[PDB]
């Protein structure tokens, strides 16, 4: 959740910097590191609104019923059945080729209308929701970068959270023993959340997708029948119906079937949005923080060095990703000790080249001893006391 | 089925014409009329092949099962589960973001493939058939134009049929008592019936359409998984599957759902082809006939005129459509009599202007006495003996 996340920046300062101003986008993480304070990771974990507002619904499959055909003789009048008074029904008026051998009198064209009742099928609804900047929640998380951490989904009593609305952006956070990071987070959505919609389908028992963040323009002009929250019936039922020509005095009525394919066509390469029932997640957004570290303290520098021998390599210094070396160690002897780390560049043994992200590495009780250092390029030798390993830097 | 059909031509001759050469397209009708013979209607009723050849099938909805995920550590190797040996299965290879907190060792990208089994759903097949000129059947129908007929779907022992293959186009036809129309019909398909296909869906209990005559090019490049007649499994299953990105070591697999809408989209305004189980109907085609009437005879001219009074109007001379006047009459007295018809143009009473399509109109037992005449333009008076009615001609 930070050595992991490919989207990792650092931020470093003069000791007499004490504000930092970042942007955090989603599921990027930043490691802030600063002279004589402990490196923190800050990151933006979640944007969402709970019970967002429902928008129009869309029919993806029509239920057609009661084909109604009424037709008049070519002088007589024009025809009507009065179900074109009603809604959630689809009606075409044609003229039918009418003679004698079709119960008429004059040879001519003999006005005809057929209507049909259009309802939507059991669970083939598609449902918008809209966001309100005033109701949305931005979640930043701080966690010290000491790596007395766990593996990628197990919390931690240092590792704290701050939740910002638009309307409240000024939390202070207690980092186990290290003191207080302050946060100030000017919220910034992305689009007009009156121009942006979470679109949902019904979970139709497959490996098929449920949900998409999508512009409110595109949604609103979709090719489908629609209503607002549980309404009478459907406007634009005719989007899903089509009529035959008239033979005689009958006129065929068709269901252009199931738009599910058609919609997921539309949505090709739109990536799916996320949802925890209540909580609707934005996929897009960022937030911009003033991270106030005038008030962190070091991991207890109050401790005596680990006996320089009793270390063994939990993890071989391995390439990190983000342009650092990281290593775990086990040190069997005494308990809470400050660790002796150092590394040096062939040529020059009397000068330490280790630039630590892991400033005052300790081995604690439960455990500890992850080290992240950045090293000059070339053949170096890394030392945790006497324990050593090679390193080449590219 | 001929005063009805908007698509009616006539053909008329010198008495010493005896061949006629027509084209008949489908569900157009021609009325041939000729000095001192009885007017016939000829027309092309049906083109079809029985049990046409099946082509590829197309899947309109996939059944996905057994998502199989296998992934390797970023030095280790590349990954395989061996279900990408198999077919009717869909496999993507990605690289997954792999670290320490994902059971690995090196920080890197750690080759992963997931496969899924793709079968097609209960009755969501789409099925071509192809035509063979050698196997197709062209049906012409002759029926005398005396209108001792019925109403638009009740046969008649005069009204005869001739069925032409490519390979046999020379029937002679016995018209009740009138003699023999000969027919010679040089068959002409339309498209290469190796470039033309009846496309079918499964009758999915709606007012939805089943069938379409369609070019074999378009069909063959459709966006769907396919097999030949009941095969192992499906090629191009991947047309209907799509994969998530890889989180960790898992990689999501999706069903782009139901192509029915998508296909009927494609087919918008293609009009539906027809099918009687065995018999597949072309919607397009025509056939070109030499109609040999050197051998028709008149309705029995052997009869005495109807008493000129005892006629009453079954149907008022009404506009036909096709540029003729048509009328029915009832004549209560004696029985088989030849009818006295005539009409005249204000100005000039001593000269008959009635040009009959209904040359030797009789009233028979069961019944009779439909008259179709064509009249010069202006105020005329039509007379069946003494019975009379006005006519204006435009």
UniProtKB/Swiss-Prot annotation, chains A, B:
Modification after translation (UniProt): N-glycosylated.
Region annotation (Fusion peptide) maps to: 97-110
Q: Which cell locations does it reside in? A: Virion membrane; Host endoplasmic reticulum membrane
State the annotated membrane topology for this chain. Answer: Multi-pass membrane protein
Q: Which residues point to the Extracellular side?
A: 1-394
User: What is the top-level taxon of the source organism?
Assistant: Viruses
What are the glycosylated positions? 153
Task: Give the disulfide map.
Answer: 2-29, 59-115, 59-120, 73-104, 91-115, 91-120, 185-289, 306-337
Instruction: Please give the subunit comment from the record.
Output: Homodimer; in the endoplasmic reticulum and Golgi. Interacts with protein prM. Interacts with non-structural protein 1.
The free-text function statement in the UniProt record for this protein reads: Binds to host cell surface receptor and mediates fusion between viral and cellular membranes. Envelope protein is synthesized in the endoplasmic reticulum in the form of heterodimer with protein prM. They play a role in virion budding in the ER, and the newly formed immature particle is covered with 60 spikes composed of heterodimer between precursor prM and envelope protein E. The virion is transported to the Golgi apparatus where the low pH causes dissociation of PrM-E heterodimers and formation of E homodimers. prM-E cleavage is inefficient, and many virions are only partially matured.
Specify the protein name: Envelope protein E
Please tell me the species this chain comes from: Tick-borne encephalitis virus Far Eastern subtype (strain Sofjin) (SOFV)
């Amino acid at each position: 959740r930070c050595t992991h996340l490919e989207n990792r920046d650092f931020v470093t300062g003069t000791q007499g910097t004490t504000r930092v101003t970042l942007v955090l986008e989603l599921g990027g993480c930043v490691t802030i590191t600063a002279e004589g304070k402990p490196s923190m990771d800050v990151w933006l974990d979640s944007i969402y609104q709970e019970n967002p507002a429902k928008t129009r619904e869309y029919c993806l499959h029509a239920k057609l019923s009661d084909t109604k055909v009424a037709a008049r003789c070519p002088t007589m009048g024009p025809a009507t059945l009065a179900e074109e008074h009603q809604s959630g029904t689809v009606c075409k008026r044609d003229q039918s080729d009418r003679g004698w051998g079709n119960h008429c009198g004059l040879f001519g064209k003999g006005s005809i209308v057929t209507c049909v009742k259009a309802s939507c099928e059991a669970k083939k609804k598609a449902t918008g929701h809209v966001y309100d900047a005033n109701k949305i929640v931005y979640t930043v998380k701080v966690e010290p970068h000491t790596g007395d951490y766990v593996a990628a989904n197990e919390t931690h009593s240092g590792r704290k959270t701050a939740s910002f609305t638009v309307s409240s952006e000024r939390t202070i956070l207690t980092m186990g023993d290290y003191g207080d990071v302050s946060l100030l987070c000017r919220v910034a959505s992305g689009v007009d959340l009156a121009q942006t919609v979470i679109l949902e389908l019904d979970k139709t028992s497959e490996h098929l997708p449920t949900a998409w963040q999508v512009h409110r323009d595109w949604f609103n002009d979709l090719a489908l029948p629609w209503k607002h929250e549980g309404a009478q019936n459907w406007n634009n039922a005719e989007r899903l119906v089509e009529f035959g020509a008239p033979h005689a005095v009958k006129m065929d009525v068709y269901n252009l079937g199931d738009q599910t394919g058609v919609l997921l066509k539309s949505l090709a390469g739109v990536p799916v949005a996320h949802i925890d029932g209540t909580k609707y997640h934005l996929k897009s957004g960022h937030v911009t923080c003033e991270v106030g570290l005038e008030k962190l303290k070091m991991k207890g520098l109050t401790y005596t060095m680990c006996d320089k021998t009793k270390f063994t390599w939990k993890r071989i210094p391995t390439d990190s990703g983000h342009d650092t070396v990281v290593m775990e160690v086990a040190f069997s002897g005494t308990k809470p000790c400050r660790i002796p780390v150092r590394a040096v560049a062939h040529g020059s043994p009397d000068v330490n080249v280790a630039m630590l992200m892991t400033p005052n590495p300790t081995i604690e009780n439960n455990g500890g001893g992850f080290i992240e250092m950045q090293l000059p390029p070339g053949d170096n030798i890394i030392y945790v006391g006497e324990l050593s390993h090679q390193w080449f830097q590219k």
